[PDB]
Structure formats: structure tokens, C-alpha cells
Amino acid sequence: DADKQEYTGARNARFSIFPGSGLFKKPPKWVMVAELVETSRLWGRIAARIDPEWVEPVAQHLIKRTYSEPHWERAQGAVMATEKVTVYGLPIVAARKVNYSQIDPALCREL
RNA sequence: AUGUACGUCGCACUCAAUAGUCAGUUUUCUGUUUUUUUUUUUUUUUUUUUUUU
Structure with missing residues (x-):
């Protein structure tokens, strides 16, 4: 969480x-834990920093892909869109310009 | 050639003052100046438990 020392984990659990x-003194932007335990609040014991690029190729069965803003671009002659990927609802990539025409063949042929 | 004609008159300014109508229960708040600044960015806090060629 931005400027707040609680950590929005998987799902809505914190x-x-x-x-x-x-x-503990420097909580990183992307940290993973080994054990989840219920106490006075929820915690993670063994914490360590990872790059958010690492998680996506190892979680191909877990990513929920989302596509918004389908707009056709002259620069590549195809439909562009901003992609969003989520594992259990977790925004691995908040926004990424992707080629929407290369993804689906049906509607962009008429476009 | 002679004789022959003349007389009186008027005008102006004005103009005040008047009808009748008695009375209205007791008590009350409302009221003044003064320091003026209204606001100054924040942090990481705890532990049942136990066994594997």
C-alpha cells in the first residue's frame, strides 16, 4: 500500500x-512470505523482496488477463489496447500497451 | 368803364378674515468592543505446535 505499512496480499486479505x-525496517514494494499465521493481526514471517516481472511467467495458469481501451493505431496498422494481468486479483502489471489485434482474429479483420 | 366777399377747446379707477369631534385598563425585556495568527508534514512493532528412506 502506498505510504502505509499494511500489505495488500493475495485476494482482499491484508x-x-x-x-x-x-x-522489517524497510518493507519493499513487492515482498513474498513463506508462512501466513493468524494472530492479533495477520503477518508474514520470512519476507524477501522480488521483482514483479518474475511472478508472471511462472504463473501462466494463474494469470487473469484483462484488456481495456481497444483503439486502432496507424503506427502498427492494428488495434492497440492496455493490458492488465492479475493473479487472484493482484495487479502484477497495472498498465501495459499491447497489440489487441494480434490477440483476437475475429473483430480486427473487419477493422 | 363801375361796384363786389373770411371763422373758439374738454374724460377716469376698482375688491379683508364665518362649527361640530368625549374617552383609550397594569407591566416588560431589547445594547456593546475586546485578544485579532483562521495553522504550521509523516511512518514501519511480534512468537500453539510438532513428526520424515
């Missing part, structure tokens, strides 16, 4: 980095 961790 937890935090354990105070005994070495990186």
Missing part, C-alpha cells in the same frame, strides 16, 4: 512483515 525480520 498482512504485514514480522517485526523480527531483518527487512
